[PDB]
Design a protein around this ligand. Structure first.
Ligand SMILES: CCCCCCCCCCCCCCCCCC(=O)OC[C@H](COP(=O)([O-])OCC(O)COP(=O)([O-])OC[C@@H](COC(=O)CCCCCCCCCCCCCCCCC)OC(=O)CCCCCCCCCCCCCCCCC)OC(=O)CCCCCCCCCCCCCCCCC
Ligand SMILES: CCCCCCCCCCCCCCCCCC(=O)OC[C@H](COP(=O)([O-])OCC[N+](C)(C)C)OC(=O)CCCCCCCCCCCCCCCCC
Ligand SMILES: CCCCCCCCCCCCCCCCCC(=O)OC[C@H](COP(=O)([O-])OCC[N+](C)(C)C)OC(=O)CCCCCCCCCCCCCCCCC
Lengths: 89, 228, 98, 50
């Protein structure tokens, strides 16, 4: 879907930034081996996605791997949010 | 745990709270960037079980534990009359109501009979994942790596450092400077100076937790609904 | 003005329990951490899912009549006027949190 | 080890690895100064020509 693609592009570019939260208290903790390994995975997924995106013009079966790589890219954690852990009222 | 016998007599668990950690929500709100869009929602999460989990301190169970230990201290003070002493214990004393222990400070001498297979995996993971990072070879404690930042500073953390006694503050700074000097050459201390897991004491988490509670105090007893 | 009559001070707190840890700590023991299983903890976190948790048993309690083991222990401690039971403040939430 | 008294390297180590071999005929390091400035000359030469 073209409109969905435009929305996803805008959201991707906007989510690379760090403009939210604005007034909620937030702070950054340390980084670890798991995060670094996932960073390597991000690099791999981006490169494979580029190559496949150009290949799919002749080979239709690569759509599966292109979509898989894009999905893996869109769900990569840059900032580990301390809000992952809390309680309920 | 060194605190376990006390926890034994208050009807609580002798096992670390590092276990029992669980996911209760689907979405992680408020959504925080710079995560990638789907990751910004928090549906799929990546954790190494070494997160802080500070916001789980806002619970009734933790307050009940703290007040049980405090009531034990006050009862002893009433019996003996050493109130002063009993309210000036170092937070690393197992009798201090805010005593905190890292999961690896007891992973080698744990009961391990009541643990689920998942919890046994968690224990082995805690030990080995500590080994991987090699802050024990830098002559450093884990709480030495809890440092504030110039921008978006962790407010509690700064206070947690100012509450430390002067000598412990100076020792922390000296350890950090030695680790800096070592890191210049990516060098480690001699193998006989490696930090034993039971020596990796959490000397700053009690102060951190006390500061968190003191900061939430005024929120729960507001002067008025629209008050600063 | 001259004679100082004597009046008892803690007469109200006589014969009230003075033991700590008390009897409740022995009969509401929780040696295995929280009393709720992981899945249950996930259900009670959401107001919607919570409604779905108690409707699975049409003859079971509801949200307003369900009591956890920790809540039972706290109520038991409160009822027995133990001297050393220092009551804890429930987590108070402002509007947005709710 | 939690109450440090030293940095990374001990004097002995630094006296065996980093300090240059002494030249009793040259107590003012003319050799080191000459070598370093001569070795800097090619950097300036390349930058100038470029
Ligand atoms: C895709 C899912 C879309 C729906 C959705 O939001 O699902 C997540 C939402 C809760 O997600 P969560 O991560 O558990 O959020 C917990 C929060 O405390 C939020 O928990 P919650 O249950 O309060 O959130 C739903 C809440 C509405 O919540 C809100 O308005 C704010 C929070 C929304 C959720 C986060 C953003 C979702 C986008 O609904 C109401 O307020 C209904 C009226 C209740 C009135 C008060 C009680 C009676 C008096 O609802 C569900 O999960 C229920 C359906 C579960 C189905 C699978 C089992
Ligand atoms: C395969 C995945 C196993 C797994 O997630 O285990 C962690 C889970 C608990 O992890 P959790 O509750 O933190 O999260 C589940 C995983 N995510 C976040 C992706 C939803 O362990 C168990 O379910 C234990 C099972 C055995 C004991 C009962
Ligand atoms: C001004 C900006 C800051 C510059 C700072 C310094 C940059 C880093 C250092 C320089 C590195 C490159 C040196 C090249 C020298 C070898 C080639 C040369 O000059 O040959 C001489 C020879 C001299 O030829 P001739 O004709 O005088 O020799 C006589 C020959 N007979 C008698 C047989 C006819 O060739 C030329 O001069 C040809 C014309 C000039 C060629 C320029 C080459 C590229 C220069 C830029 C390269 C650097 C990266 C790109 C920068 C782009 C900027 C827009």
């Amino acid at each position: 879907h073209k409109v969905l693609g435009i929305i996803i592009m805008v959201l991707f570019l906007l989510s690379l930034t760090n403009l939210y939260p604005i007034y909620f208290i937030r702070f950054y903790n340390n980084i670890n081996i798991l995060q670094r390994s996932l960073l390597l995975l991000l690099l791999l997924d981006l490169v494979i996605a580029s190559k496949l995106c150009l290949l799919i013009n002749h080979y239709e079966s690569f759509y599966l791997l292109l979509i898989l790589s894009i999905l893996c890219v869109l769900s990569h954690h840059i900032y580990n949010t301390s809000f992952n852990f809390s309680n309920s009222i | 745990m060194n605190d376990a016998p006390i926890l034994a007599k208050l009807g609580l668990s002798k096992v670390n709270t590092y276990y029992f950690q669980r996911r209760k929500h689907i979405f992680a709100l408020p959504i925080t960037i710079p995560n990638f869009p789907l990751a910004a929602l928090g549906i799929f999460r990546s954790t190494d079980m070494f997160e802080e989990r500070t916001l789980e301190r806002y619970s009734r169970d933790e307050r009940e534990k703290t007040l049980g230990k405090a009531a034990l201290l006050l009862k002893e003070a009433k019996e003996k009359g050493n109130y002063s002493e009993l309210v000036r214990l170092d937070p690393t004393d197992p009798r201090h109501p805010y005593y905190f222990e890292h999961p690896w400070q007891s992973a080698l001498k744990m009961d391990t009979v009541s643990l689920t297979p998942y919890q046994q995996y968690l224990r082995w993971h805690c030990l080995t994942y500590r080994a991987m990072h090699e802050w024990d070879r830098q002559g450093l404690l884990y709480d030495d790596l809890m440092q504030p930042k110039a921008l978006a500073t962790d407010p509690f953390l700064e206070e947690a450092i100012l509450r430390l006694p002067y000598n412990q503050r100076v020792e922390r700074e000296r350890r950090l400077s030695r680790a800096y000097d070592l890191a210049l050459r990516r060098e480690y201390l001699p193998d006989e100076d490696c930090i034993h897991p039971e020596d990796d004491v959490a000397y700053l988490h009690p102060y951190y937790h006390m500061v968190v509670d003191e900061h939430r105090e005024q929120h729960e007893n507001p002067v008025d609904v629209y008050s600063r | 003005k001259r004679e100082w009559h004597v009046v008892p001070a803690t007469k109200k707190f006589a014969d009230v329990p003075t033991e700590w840890p008390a009897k409740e700590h022995e009969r509401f023991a929780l040696p295995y951490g929280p009393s709720e299983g992981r899945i249950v903890s996930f259900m009670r976190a959401s107001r919607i899912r919570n409604r779905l948790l108690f409707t699975l048993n049409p003859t079971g309690y509801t949200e307003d009549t369900y009591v956890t083991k920790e809540a039972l222990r706290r109520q038991a401690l409160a009822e027995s006027k133990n001297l050393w039971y220092l009551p804890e403040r429930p987590v108070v939430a402002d509007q947005l949190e709710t | 080890q939690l109450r440090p008294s030293r940095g990374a390297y001990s004097d002995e180590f630094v006296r065996e690895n980093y300090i240059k071999a002494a030249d009793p005929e040259d107590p003012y390091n003319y050799r080191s100064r000459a070598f370093t400035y001569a070795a800097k000359i090619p950097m300036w030469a390349g930058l100038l020509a470029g």
